[PDB]
Write a protein that binds this ligand. Structure first.
Ligand SMILES: Cc1c(O)cccc1C(=O)O
Length: 167
């Protein structure tokens, strides 16, 4: 049993809810919250901007030190950093950004990072401002992630469409 509440069960391991990921993290304090980051860990907008704002910019300060030491992530890659006030850990995962022309096949590689963690609170990778079709992102998630993932979808009209269209 875990603390996640109000989710619809899609599969053995994937759950979904219409929720603001920031508000969900603040309530649950999950072991892992996933950030939809860019390779530079520049948390300017969408999930990354909202998460970073909720940490009072501490996420960005930590991320700048990570990049200064290690250089940029790979598209499809990840790093584990602090969850600050939101979670124990933040898994920063880089899905491909369609609005930059990145290979959508890298979305499966991005979701494979989730398999290193038993339970996660996450957004749909590569969707929203990254340009991908969220229906596609949910299908890749279900077909890639084997660990227990609790998906938070901010957009109400999109949540209802993801559920209604789910195969
Ligand atoms: C996945 C997504 C969209 O495709 C569009 C707007 C918000 C979101 C979100 O849940 O963050």
């Amino acid at each position: 049993v875990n603390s996640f509440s109000g989710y619809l069960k899609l599969t053995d391991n994937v759950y979904i809810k219409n929720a603001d990921i920031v508000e969900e993290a603040k309530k649950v304090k999950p072991t892992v919250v996933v950030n939809a980051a860019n390779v530079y860990l520049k948390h300017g907008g969408g999930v990354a901007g909202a998460l970073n704002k909720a940490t009072n910019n501490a996420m960005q300060v930590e991320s700048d030190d990570y990049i200064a030491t290690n250089g940029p992530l790979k598209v499809g890659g990840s790093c584990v950093l602090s969850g600050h006030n939101l979670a124990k850990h933040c898994l920063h995962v880089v899905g491909p950004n369609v609005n930059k022309g990145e290979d959508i096949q890298l979305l499966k590689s991005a979701y494979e990072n989730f398999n290193q963690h038993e339970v996660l609170l996450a957004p749909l990778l590569s969707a929203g401002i990254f340009g991908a079709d969220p229906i596609h992102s949910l299908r890749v998630c279900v077909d890639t992630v084997r660990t227990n993932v609790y998906l938070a979808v901010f957009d109400k009209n999109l949540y209802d469409k993801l559920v209604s269209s789910f195969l």
